[PDB]
Each structure stands twice: as C-alpha cells, then as structure tokens.
Symmetry: D3
Subunit: 243 residues, 6 copies
Amino acid sequence: SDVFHLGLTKNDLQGATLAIVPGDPDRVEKIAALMDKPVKLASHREFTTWRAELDGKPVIVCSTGIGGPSTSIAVEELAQLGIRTFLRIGTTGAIQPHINVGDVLVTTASVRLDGASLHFAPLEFPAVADFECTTALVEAAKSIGATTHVGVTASSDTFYPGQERYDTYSGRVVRHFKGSMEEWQAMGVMNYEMESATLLTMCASQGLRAGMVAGVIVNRTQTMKQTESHAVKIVVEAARRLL
Amino acid sequence: SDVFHLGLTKNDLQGATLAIVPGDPDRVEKIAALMDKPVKLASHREFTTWRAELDGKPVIVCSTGIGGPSTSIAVEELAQLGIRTFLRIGTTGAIQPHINVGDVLVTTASVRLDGASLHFAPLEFPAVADFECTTALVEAAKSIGATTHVGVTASSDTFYPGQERYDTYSGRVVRHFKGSMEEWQAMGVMNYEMESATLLTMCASQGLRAGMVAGVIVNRTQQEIPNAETMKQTESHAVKIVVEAARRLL
Amino acid sequence: SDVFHLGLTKNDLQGATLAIVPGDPDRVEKIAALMDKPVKLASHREFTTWRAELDGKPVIVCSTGIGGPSTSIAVEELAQLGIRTFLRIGTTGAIQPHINVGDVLVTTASVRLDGASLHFAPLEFPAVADFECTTALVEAAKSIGATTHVGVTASSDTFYPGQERYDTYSGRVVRHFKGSMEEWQAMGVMNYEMESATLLTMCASQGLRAGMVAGVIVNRTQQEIPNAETMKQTESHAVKIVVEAARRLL
Amino acid sequence: KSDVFHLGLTKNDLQGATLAIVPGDPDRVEKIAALMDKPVKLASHREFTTWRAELDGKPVIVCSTGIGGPSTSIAVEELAQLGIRTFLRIGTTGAIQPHINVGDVLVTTASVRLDGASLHFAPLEFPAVADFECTTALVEAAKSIGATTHVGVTASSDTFYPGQERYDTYSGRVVRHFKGSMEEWQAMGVMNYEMESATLLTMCASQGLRAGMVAGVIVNRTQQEIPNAETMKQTESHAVKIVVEAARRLL
Amino acid sequence: SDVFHLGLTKNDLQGATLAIVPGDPDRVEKIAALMDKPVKLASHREFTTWRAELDGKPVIVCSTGIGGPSTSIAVEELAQLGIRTFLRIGTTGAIQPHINVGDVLVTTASVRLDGASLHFAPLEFPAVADFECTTALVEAAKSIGATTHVGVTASSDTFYPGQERYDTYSGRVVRHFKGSMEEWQAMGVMNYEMESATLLTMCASQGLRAGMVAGVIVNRTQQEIPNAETMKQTESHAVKIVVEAARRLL
Amino acid sequence: KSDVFHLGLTKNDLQGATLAIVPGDPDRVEKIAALMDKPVKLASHREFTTWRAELDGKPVIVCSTGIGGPSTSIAVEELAQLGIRTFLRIGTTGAIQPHINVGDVLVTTASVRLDGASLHFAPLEFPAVADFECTTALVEAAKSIGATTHVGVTASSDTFYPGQERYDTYSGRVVRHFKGSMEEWQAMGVMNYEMESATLLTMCASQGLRAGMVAGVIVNRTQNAETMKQTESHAVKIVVEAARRLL
Ligand SMILES: O=c1[nH]c(=O)n(COCCO)cc1Cc1cccc(OCc2ccccc2)c1
Ligand SMILES: O=c1[nH]c(=O)n(COCCO)cc1Cc1cccc(OCc2ccccc2)c1
Ligand SMILES: O=c1[nH]c(=O)n(COCCO)cc1Cc1cccc(OCc2ccccc2)c1
Ligand SMILES: O=c1[nH]c(=O)n(COCCO)cc1Cc1cccc(OCc2ccccc2)c1
Ligand SMILES: O=c1[nH]c(=O)n(COCCO)cc1Cc1cccc(OCc2ccccc2)c1
Ligand SMILES: O=c1[nH]c(=O)n(COCCO)cc1Cc1cccc(OCc2ccccc2)c1
Ligand SMILES: [K+]
Ligand SMILES: [K+]
Ligand SMILES: [K+]
C-alpha cells in the first residue's frame, strides 16, 4: 500500500480523481453496483474501498466511517492517491417541520459542531461546499425528480448530546448543547449529521472540491431503504456531471 | 419613516423584495441608473436609498457604509420594510497571485473576522451565501464575459491590522492577526473585504437570501496603491453583473 | 490625498493634533460652527471633515460613521495625518433607571461587544479612556452645568440583537445576548452605543489619547421611541461639552 | 434483533455483562475474545463489531469503537444502555518522548482534549481523567506480565495527521493552532498520541461510568514515522494480554 | 536567600525532595509537629516554611495560601530549591449528598475554574494528579481507616460566585457560573476547593509529582455554616493521612 | 464572634468605616495604619491581617489581601459585607517600559485581565477599570507629595513567573499563550506587571463599589532592599493622602 490505512496504491485507482464517500462500509458495494464494472479493492478497519466505471471513467467509492476523525484519515489518504473531488452521501435526521422522511438534502455549508475541522482551519473559516459540486448535486436531484431542500446542516461530533437527544443513559445534555436544537431550527438549519463539517472544512481549506448530500430517514419534530436508494442514485448522477 | 435610520416607509418600496446593497453611498445612484425609472428616496447618515425598476418590478438600492455594524442596521431595517433578497456589490483586495486587478469575485462563504455576525449566530455557524443568489451572480458574470473566481472571502472588521497592513501609524499588527494573510492564502481564500461575513451570517440565519460579488481593485501580492482608472472600470463591471444577477432573482 | 479614505493631506490639518469624532456626518458642521474660522475640507463616503480654530489653535472635526470598522479607518488615517487626541461625541440609549433623557454620560471604559477592538488588542485588554480626556470631559460637563453620569458603557457591533432589541424582523436574539441587558444593568453599565470599544481600545494600545461623551436620547427601562425636539437639544448640550473639553486638552 | 440504534445488540445478548473492552480496530475484537473462555460473535455493523466472552465465569463484552470520538461516543453510550458500567480501551499509539521505546505499553491517567466529542459531555475545563480503579488494575496487570510500562498523560487528537503535527501530507502544512504543538506537549511530559481516549474518559467520568486506557507503542515520533509490522503485531498481542488481565481485576 | 518570596536557601532544605503544601499558614506548625525534629525556617507574607524529618529523611512543610497565584509562587520556588514531590492537604465543601462532614477526599483530577493553570498549560490539558501520589494517599487513608471518596474536584478562583454562593453583598452570580454547581453535581464532581487545579496542572506539565487530599468540613446539600468541634477534628484527621502518604513516597 | 467567614470581623469592629486600604503584603498593614491616628490591631487570620485607624476624625480600615485574585476576592467581598464601599490598593510592581524608573509611582486606570477571578464577576469583555474619583484622588495625592508618577494600563497576572514572561525558572519555559507577551504589552503602552488589580477592579466596578490602584516600582524589566523600603513608604504616603480626599 502507498498509504497508512486505506490499503491502496495509486495503480488501484486507475487515474481516478473523484471519490464518492459514504459513512457506512456496507453502503460501498450498493453505490458501486449502480455503476459499470464495480470491483472490491480493499477493506481495512472502517475503510472499505470499491472501484467502478462511470461513463468510461474510473470512480472510487470509499467509506469514511462515522465522524470527522476517520473521515479526515480517509479523505487525506485518498488525496495522496490522486483524488481531488469528494462527494459525500449520508443519512440524516431533519429538524425542520416542512422536511419529510424520504426527502433529499444538499448542504451548502455546515455548522461546525465537530473537533476535526479545527485541525484544518480556525472556527471562523466556513465549512462551505464546493460550488460546482453543490450545483451538480442539485441538478442531479432535479434530474431524478426528488423532493430536495438546499441549505445549512448541523454537523455534530456526537449522535446523542450534540443532537440534543435526552433518551440516553444519563438523560442529560451539557449546558452548551441545552436548547441548541431549537436555536438551529430558528436559524433555518435543516438537519443533523456527523461528517460534513470536517469534510467540507478540510477540502475547502486545501484546494479540494467537496459536495454533501443526505437522505432524510427521520424528522425530529415528528422507507429507510428506499430513501438511501434515492440518495445513492443522486450522488452517482452528480459524479457524472463532475467527471 | 417606518424605521429608525433609513427614513423609509413600506409604501416607499412599492412592493420591493430585492435590494442591492453597496458600501459606498455614492455608488447607489450609479447602480440605480443602470435600471429603469430610477428615483432617489432618502439619504440619512451613511444610508442612501434609491428605488428603480427591473423587468417591471420595483428594486431597492441602499448603501450600508463600511463594516458589519451599519450593514446590520441597513439589512434589518430593509427586512422590516419587506426586503427578502440582498445582493452586495463591493470593492476588494485580492490575496491570491492568480487573481488580477479587474477580475470579479463571487463569494460562496466568508471567514468571519467580524463582530456583528456573532450577534446573529455563534462562530461555528457558516457565513454562507444563498445558493440561488450565488448561481445568479456566477451566471450573470458569465453572461457579460468577465474573468470570474468563485470561493471563500476573508471579511474583516478593520481595513488595516485585520488585513495585515503594516504601513500604519503604529506599524504593528496584534498577535492574533500576525501571519494571518499567509494562512488565509494557503487556505485558498481569495480576498479581503469588510461586510460579507455580517451580511451572509445575518441573512442565512434569518431566512433571508444573500449574495456577494466584488471587483478586484488591488492585488496584495503585486501592488499596494489602486489605479485611478481601472477602479472606475472595475466598479462599472461589477455593477453590471449585480444588476443582471438581480434580473434572474426577481 | 495622503490617506486612503479621508481625502486629506497633512497641509489641510494645519498642524492640528486634536480631533473631535462624531458618528453622524451631518453633525460635523454643527460642531465646527461652535468654534472659530470653520472650513470644510473633504467629504468621502461616511467621512466628512471640517477644520476649525479653538483658542487660536487648529482643531479637526471628522465623522466616523456607525460602528468600529469605519471608526477604525477614520482614526488610523487621522493618526497618520498627525492627530494624537480623539474626542468622541455620540448619542446613546441608557439602561439604568436613574439616568434620564437629556443627561450626558462620560465613559471611563467600555464593555467590548465589538469585533474591531480585537484587531488592536486581545479581549483581556481594557477598552479604557485616557485619564486627561475623561477629566476634561467631566470638568467641561460641570462647567456648563449638565446632569452627568460617569462610568462603564456597553459598546455593541449591532443596534438591535446586541442591545437586546426584540422588535425586529426575526423577533429573536441569539443565545449569547439573551438576558444580556439585565446582566449589564446589574453590573452598573450605564448605556449602549456602537463605537467606544473600538475607539478606546485602538487608542489606548497605540499611545493615542481618547475620550468619550454621549447624550441620552432614550431610556430603555422607560420607553423605546425618542422625542424629536429633545434629541436636537441633547445633541446641542453634548456638543457644547465636547468642544469645552477640547479647550482644556489643547 | 436490536435494543440500540447502531450496535445491533439486545440486552439479552450481553447475558448480564457489566464490563466492556473497547478496541478501535474491528479486527482486534476477535483477537481479544480469543484470550477468554467460550468466544462467540454477536454482531457486525458499520465499524461496530461485538464479541461475547467469559472471564472467570463472568461474561465480558468486546466491542470496537472505530477511529475517533464520534463513533466511540455512540459505542460507549449504547453499551451503557445495555448495562455496561466499566469500559477498558486498548489501542495503538505513537510515542513522542525519547525514553519510550517501540513495544512499550502506556497507561493513561488523563488526556489532553484535542477532540470535539468530549465537549458534548463536559466543558473543556473538565479533566479527561481515567477511573482510579481501572488505572490501578491496568498498571498492576502490566506489572503482572512484566512489560515496560509508562504511566502519564496522553494527547488525544481528532486527526491522525495535522493534530499530531504530521507534515508528510497532501497539503504539507499544519494549521497555526497545531504548529509547534508536538514540541509543546513533549515539554509538558505528554507521552503519546492517540485518537479516542479524550472522548472515552470525559464521557465516562462525567456520567458515573468507569474507564481505563492502555496502548501499545508501535512508533516513536523522535525515532521514525513508519511502524515495523512485526513488532506492531507483537505489541498488539502484548497489550491485549494486559487489558484482559486488567478486566480480571475489575470484575 | 536563593528565592524571591520564600526566604529559603538550598541549604535550609538539607536535600529535601518532598513538600507538604497546606493553604493555611497556621497548619504548617501542626503538620511539622507530627514528624521528628521540627524547626521554623522562614515566615514571609503568606508563606511559612518548616523543616521536619520522616524516617531519617528531611521533609519540608510550606504554606501556599488561598488560590492559584500564591500556590504558583510557592511550588515554583520550592522546585528551584530542590523539591520534586508536592502533597496538598486542604479543607473543602462537598457537593454530593452521599459525602458527609468528616470524610476525606482524594483528587484524581480537577475541573479548572482557575486562571493560574492556564499560565502553565492550555485548558485542554488535564489537571491530573500523579498516579503514585494518589495511590499513596488512598492507601494512607485506608491505613488509618477513614471514610474516603476518590474522584474529580472543582477548583475555583473564588470562594463565593465560582462556588455558586448567593449569600453575598451583590447576591448574584455571573451568567457563566449560574447553575454551575448543579452541572458539576450531575457530572459526579465531589467538592469545591481553591488550589488543586493550579497545583496539579503546573506539576503534571513540568515533570513534578503532585497529590491532593482534603477534609470535608461543610456540605452544600446539607448545611452552609461549618460545625463546632468536628471541623477541628477533620483537620487533624486529614493531616495524619498526608504524612502517612509522604512515608510511602519517600 | 464573627459576621464573616475568613476575616474574623464583626460590623461593630469597623465603627462605620466605609473606606479600606488593601495591600497585598500582611506586614504592610501595620506600616499604613501607623501613618494615621489611633492604630489598633483587629484580626490576623490566614493571610488576612486587619488594622483600624482614624483619618481626619473618620475611621479607616487597613486589610491585607495576600497575593493574587482568589484571596483578594475573599477580602473585598467580606469587607463589603461589613460595610466597606471604597477600596484603595497599594502594591509593589515590576515596570516594563524603559522610561519608568525604580522608585516611580504608578496609578492604574484599568488592567489587562490575565487573571481567573475577574471572570467570576464579569465576562472578559467587561473592562477592569478603576473608579474615576479614586483614580483622581490618587493622581492628586501623588502630585501633592511630589512623586514621579505615570498613569495608564497595568497587566495583572495570576502568576509571578510565566504570566510575566520570566524564564529564570525550574522549567525555564513559558507556555505558548504567554510567549512574547511582554513585548506585546510593551508595544501597547502597558506600564507594569502586578497580581491583584484585575480582580479588584473588575469585582468592584461590576458591583457598585469604588476602587483605586497605586503601586511603587521596585524593578524595571528592561534593565534592591534599601530602595524597596523607600519606594514602599513613598506609595504608602500617597495611598493615605488619597484616602483623605475620598472620605
Ligand atoms: O438523527 C440522525 N442524526 C445523524 O447524525 N445521522 C447520521 O448518521 C449518524 C450515524 O447513524 C442520522 C440520523 C437519523 C437516525 C434517527 C434514529 C436512529 C438512526 O440510526 C440507525 C437506525 C436505522 C434504522 C432503524 C433503527 C436505527 C438514525
Ligand atoms: O484591500 C482592500 N480591502 C478592503 O477591505 N476593501 C473594501 O473596501 C473597504 C473600504 O475601502 C477594498 C480593498 C482594496 C483597496 C486597497 C488600497 C486602498 C483602498 O482604498 C480606497 C481607495 C479606492 C480607490 C482608489 C484609491 C483609494 C482599497
Ligand atoms: O439605543 C441606542 N443605541 C445606540 O447604539 N445608539 C447610538 O447610535 C447608533 C446609531 O443610531 C443610540 C441609541 C438611542 C436610540 C433609541 C431608539 C432609536 C434610535 O435611532 C435613530 C433615531 C433618533 C431620533 C428619533 C428617531 C430615530 C436611537
Ligand atoms: O501515531 C499514531 N497516532 C495515533 O493516533 N494512533 C492510533 O491509531 C490510529 C489509527 O492508526 C497510532 C499511531 C502510530 C502509527 C504511526 C504511523 C502509521 C500508523 O498507521 C497504520 C499502520 C500500522 C502498522 C504498520 C503500518 C501502518 C500508526
Ligand atoms: O466550601 C468550601 N470551598 C473552598 O474552596 N474551601 C477551601 O478553603 C478556602 C478558604 O476558606 C473550603 C470550603 C468549606 C467552607 C464553608 C464555609 C466557610 C468556610 O470558611 C472558614 C471558616 C472556618 C471555620 C468556621 C467558619 C468559617 C469554609
Ligand atoms: O515584577 C514584579 N511583578 C509583580 O507581580 N509584583 C507584585 O508583587 C507580587 C508578589 O511579590 C512585583 C514585581 C517586582 C519584583 C521583581 C523581582 C523580585 C520580586 O520579589 C520579592 C522581593 C522582595 C525583596 C527583595 C527581593 C525580592 C519583585
Ligand atoms: K459605517
Ligand atoms: K469512526
Ligand atoms: K494568597
């Protein structure tokens, strides 16, 4: 291998500059199967890699795992191997009443409730998505005709307290995050996920292109396989426009 | 007046929902003159307002003055009068070697080196431009055929120390901003201006649409003093792009 | 012009070392008219400058506009032209029940709710006024016989959320500023304005003398809407004090 | 099928276990369970691989967290929901002190919080401190098998590269905040870099849960960058033995 | 003297490496009396130093005073003279209902509600006690048979607002510390004291060994005013442990 | 026996005194009290020694705070509970400006908050500013006895060594945050380093209490026991003269 964790050489990529980067290792095969000639390359820790062909061009699918820390490893090591465009497809919990289960969300920029983003840029730096990647994702969503919302995402280092979940062992949330969901809601924040702040910050501050799309599987103010499928079809179609 | 500072009533706007918001009061007449039926409304402090017509739709032009504080007054009071879409046209100093004087820059999001943005959202919230507004600006720039760069802008509460200028009375820069320009440069930040962080943060966190475009009148890696001939042309170029962008957002 | 924004040369100042700095461009002529041989020098953006004579000595009057950013430009460029003493005269909203409309307030130091001050000194540095300038202002207020209060001012980068105003488009205040007015009240903070933190910090950390005085045109515990007639009368009273204080500092 | 959102485990699966060994690597779970009696695989979902084993008749859980605090916080919280009250982390690490060699084992008393997830449980001023009984058991377990052990502070980073001041990267640069940071930690007596302890220790100590932290040194930063693969396998096996032995003392 | 404040030479220590460090200058005479051959070395400001002998090995007793600042002076200057191990014995207010008056608490690590710790390490660095020192203290407590609790301590720069006391002149607590006691309680924090954060941070970040033990004289969930004889009983109760722990560390 | 927790004082002990001179050094308390009429010891507990004196007919309290904000906050709070509204601090200091000599007196208008205790009373953005009347009285008192006086900003640190960028220490190092900090303060016109003013000034200004700060320069960092005694007496004579104007 040419990298520490991913178990990949530059030869394995076949000159690929684009990667679709899901959180779940189990999703990698499902995404690649929507493209031509998909093949498993490697699987180490939470990092599962497949290579596939899209319109004649090689494309990488690689899992980051949950959270910024492993995302930062995966994105970086993919960049070392020649990847320049990163497209994240994820799952999410919506926090706006008008967003339904099954809807797809494209993130323009993220609220940085993570730690890893700070290792690339100070907090004042915007966790903003690449304009071309966001454009391609919005266009791809319209192409397949999905209910789409474009806007800001809250990207949290935890699933529970950082997303103000009280149904926990302790049953409590630290002062900093007490009443935080309501605050994000009033600010027009669409949803909660766990990787976008790191991905978008580290790419935008390093000359790498990044896009973010997610399927709504739950609304916090208020099917799962169908939603994931819908979002997977959009992230592949967006990659088509960006090759 | 329905508002504290602008000297405008809701009737003055005539159903306007879009405003073009330059920093310079003197730019307001120049922007309005590019549109149909341009008329002066009010001038109070650094807030000069004109109304014009675009494709039969009333549009507002209102100066913010330099900086987030007066910007925040202008945007708040315009929102109270019915404005939902805000398009900023400004001047800027580029910090990337590949960006030339005369180029136009569209801001996707801003580095928050301001104070006023914090009065609307905590620092972790992105000073991000509205996607439709950014799209319209990029397309408008492509329509008139200008050299355009799209990316991140550093928005500073000062012209001098916050933009790491040493040619000053004290000749020094506070620790926090020492070596900061080099840091932004390495992070791919295009330019320095003084209003976008406040504008973009306050709009994105309040359900208002905002866009940001600027003409490059200086490149900080090449030359210090701006040219008093290209500055006129650059301002004209950017004004034509913002007006065309407004046309797409009506 | 020797400076980027003010449109002034060293000659225009005629050796002046003191500047009176209001926020309102229209207040500039009103201040200069109180002194001898008043003359207009320049008007660019929110910066309007007049020169006058006080006790046979040249004095500058120059508007800053609303907010620290434009204040920081004006002060820096005045310092480059030879100004070493800055006296701010402003308007303010009082937050203590014992301070009435028409009262004058002298600021010893400011709560830094701004961004621009951080570009000159870290937050831990006090936004403190110059002792000689404060003394002259207190004595000048006692000379004309005005109701004066001396103490701490909250200096905000916004007019609305940073001063906990809820009568807005959004109708909400960010967590950081929720309940903040009551907190300042309990801490003995007199009032809200928008420039003192920047002015005082940037001067005290650069060897420049600064003073701050303001006329109360609204009390936030009593009412919200200012009166038209008393506002002009209060401005007149404070302008008299600032000129009288400038007399003592020449 | 599952009493929790991510782990794919019911409380019935645990059989009354109150102690969990939490490695970062999913593939290490099978290795840890093989040291104990009657090992069975319970679930495999995402980065969370769970095995059940028996130690002195008492059931023990081994469950991977994955790299970093975010997934660690999910694993720990969901195991706590299923009845786990004691957590023991076994990991790999890069040492930053010249006197610590490759193959050495490190027990963490407390961690420098260079992570984000810990803040979601307690403000920065709260110490990322390990449980005293867990730390005691780990030190005693290390002395029991006779390993070269160092006890002290660990720097726990949300990144592998810039947060651990690695310059051999795509960008080749480190953000101002972390520039010269390794030297600063070195002077402060910080032993090593890893990626989970700050989250684990903070979230446990602020929620009445017992946590311990042990790691095998596979690289010294003042000596080299690329780890030796032979000594890595030996160090991993060495550290695994200590964490199982420490689990014995805490049951 | 070789130091600025303590008034001691390297000679006066006689090769001592361990120091017991109480806050109360009056406690120094009490701790030194428990060991063989006690003598007064110096009394300057809040620093009183006594030399004693334990198992034929010289041990130093030196008062820090209340708070981090003077603790930072005492520890640093003792370290210059040759002290490598520090054992703090203090008084404390418990905030957990299960901890009674008379109980002894051993601190593994401290919540950093102080300023001095930041002068040695950034906030993210843990205010953790030395493992050997903590072990010796726990074993010493079990040796004499006291009711002991081991865990986290909140170390505050104030006695009143930082420990959320409302029975004060102002009768108020700053926003940051409002509801803070309840938060620490839920996080399993045992108690409040005023020196451990500084001591533990400065030692752990400088290669020095530090331990922390305290006697509970008040319970915040029970009664606010300290008791009669049991208060004096608790001091002598806790003093014996810190000397027995010193025996294990020599 | 006691109305407070630490000082060991009752409201009756004060005799209606509203002003208190607060040195850091417990041994300085007797020195200050001896300059006024009828000096008498009240209490000596921990680091807090209290003496009562009389000035111009009106009673005055002198009480030591000890070094640093934490114990200072105890002293000031408990004195305020007993009826003190005006606090005048007299201290020693290390000057960091080349033009300030050993023996000079410094009056603090406001302080750089390099302490922790001030934050327990007001957030960092709040100015550690001295009371205008107290500062006026101190400046006038210094001019009255004819001392070389400088008025301006003071850096108030929670440590004597690293926070004042001293490298002659056990570790020989200074944490990143304070590395190059002295030079930064110097360029900002900060006069000196001491250890109590930020806490005192913040806690008083945010609680409706009047506070003043004066210090004698015993060392200049850009560049003695006998000079230390003469400087102490110079500043003490000023702080008592300032107390006369404020009663
Ligand atoms: O609220 C969320 N927050 C969030 O950060 N994500 C993103 O993925 C993080 C790891 O699941 C996703 C969601 C939506 C959600 C809500 C409840 C349980 C979830 O988890 C897995 C699961 C799927 C189907 C049935 C039960 C549990 C996910
Ligand atoms: O570097 C900059 N930073 C910046 O924040 N802006 C935005 O406008 C702020 C008010 O000028 C604009 C610039 C470009 C620039 C560079 C040097 C002097 C400048 O000042 C005024 C001016 C305009 C045209 C010709 C001479 C002077 C402006
Ligand atoms: O509360 C205040 N806060 C404050 O920062 N200032 C300083 O001037 C800022 C620019 O107006 C002034 C005030 C007092 C005040 C209160 C309500 C409306 C205000 O606005 C302009 C106005 C003046 C007179 C009559 C109608 C509107 C001013
Ligand atoms: O410096 C470190 N920092 C750190 O946070 N860890 C903890 O595990 C993170 C995942 O490897 C581990 C190390 C040690 C290290 C150094 C270089 C490459 C590494 O990665 C994978 C690998 C293991 C063995 C042989 C070659 C590569 C690990
Ligand atoms: O809650 C506390 N917080 C704390 O930081 N300490 C540590 O000592 C600080 C100086 O007393 C000690 C305590 C316990 C306490 C509670 C009320 C009054 C206290 O003070 C001195 C006193 C001793 C005997 C009789 C009355 C008061 C001490
Ligand atoms: O630099 C200083 N910083 C400072 O915070 N202070 C205020 O007193 C705090 C405790 O002494 C005082 C000074 C001046 C100084 C310089 C060197 C040694 C010092 O220490 C005590 C001493 C007294 C008499 C003879 C020699 C040293 C004091
Ligand atoms: K302005
Ligand atoms: K992970
Ligand atoms: K003290």
